[PDB]
Structure formats: C-alpha cells, structure tokens
Amino acid sequence: YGSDMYKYIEQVTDTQSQDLGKAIENAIEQGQTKDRQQDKGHEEYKDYEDTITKS
C-alpha cells in the first residue's frame, strides 16, 4: 500500500557516492653556481704623417 509501491512497480535504482581527497606535496630545491672568467688583451699601433708647406 501507499506511494512507495510505485518505486517497485518501475525498477528504480538510487545510487549515491562521495569521494573525499587530500594531497600534500612538499618540494625543496637547492642550487649552486660557480663561474670563472680570465681574459687577455694586447694591441699595438704605428702612425706616420708628413706635412710639407709652402708660403
């Protein structure tokens, strides 16, 4: 009797669910760098200029 009978009359499937997730990620990064530059320079030059005048 009652209304609930209709649920059985037409096959009714009630489905539920619940997913509860948790996630913690911890990352530690360290880095070191070492550089070294060594240069050398050398330049040499020569010039000549001759001026002759008449007046």
User: Binding residue for another protein (CB under 8 A) from 22, 36, 46, 54?
Assistant: 36
CB of 17 to another protein, least distance (A): 49
d(CA 22, CA 20): 7
d(CA 6, CA 10): 7
- For another protein, the closer of residues 36 and 46 by Cβ is 36
54 binds another protein (CB under 8 A): no
d(CA 48, CA 55): 23
Can you give the binding site for another protein, defined by CB under 8 A? 30, 32, 34, 36
